[PDB]
Write an enzyme that holds these catalytic residues in place. Sequence first.
Site, PDB file in Angstrom:
ATOM      1  CG  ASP A  16     -25.321 -53.601 179.433  1.00  0.00           C
ATOM      2  OD1 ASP A  16     -24.789 -54.125 178.749  1.00  0.00           O
ATOM      3  OD2 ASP A  16     -24.407 -53.447 180.583  1.00  0.00           O
ATOM      4  CG  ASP A  35     -25.400 -49.140 185.447  1.00  0.00           C
ATOM      5  OD1 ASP A  35     -24.879 -49.081 184.966  1.00  0.00           O
ATOM      6  OD2 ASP A  35     -25.724 -47.927 185.494  1.00  0.00           O
ATOM      7  CD  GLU A  38     -22.936 -55.905 183.200  1.00  0.00           C
ATOM      8  OE1 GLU A  38     -22.406 -56.591 182.558  1.00  0.00           O
ATOM      9  OE2 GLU A  38     -22.016 -55.225 184.197  1.00  0.00           O
ATOM     10  NE  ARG A  82     -19.258 -51.082 176.186  1.00  0.00           N
ATOM     11  CZ  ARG A  82     -19.840 -51.897 177.752  1.00  0.00           C
ATOM     12  NH1 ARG A  82     -20.269 -52.390 176.877  1.00  0.00           N
ATOM     13  NH2 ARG A  82     -18.915 -50.682 178.429  1.00  0.00           N
TER      14      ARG A  82
END
Length: 136
Positions: A16, A35, A38, A82
């Site tokens: 992501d 999403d 991760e 970000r």
Amino acid sequence: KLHKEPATLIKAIDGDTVKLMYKGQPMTFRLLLVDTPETKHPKKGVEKYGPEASAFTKKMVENAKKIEVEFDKGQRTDKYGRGLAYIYADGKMVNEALVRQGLAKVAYVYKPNNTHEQHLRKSEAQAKKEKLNIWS
């Protein structure tokens, strides 16, 4: 009207997150509206489909001739600095490709950063009905 701007890959970081050179500056971009599992999770760590989501984003951006970023109509950065954007690899939205493959879920949405929400949700419904990856 949203518009695309050019950018240059620096490094893919996670399913992501990608680092790009944008208007002459290195910047970390979080992909809007999705999403992924991760690899670098604040809490859990390396979740299921994490490595896979992360390889998919990496390959897609590394093998592109052109990368473009598209900001939405609301805030363009998050609290970590970000960039918040839709990212395109040769014309193909990375955010959508992940969701279409069952490698990401549509995130909780925050207006007005939600221009491509219905489109993503349609791909998510197809990946669920096809029981792909996360949905298997």
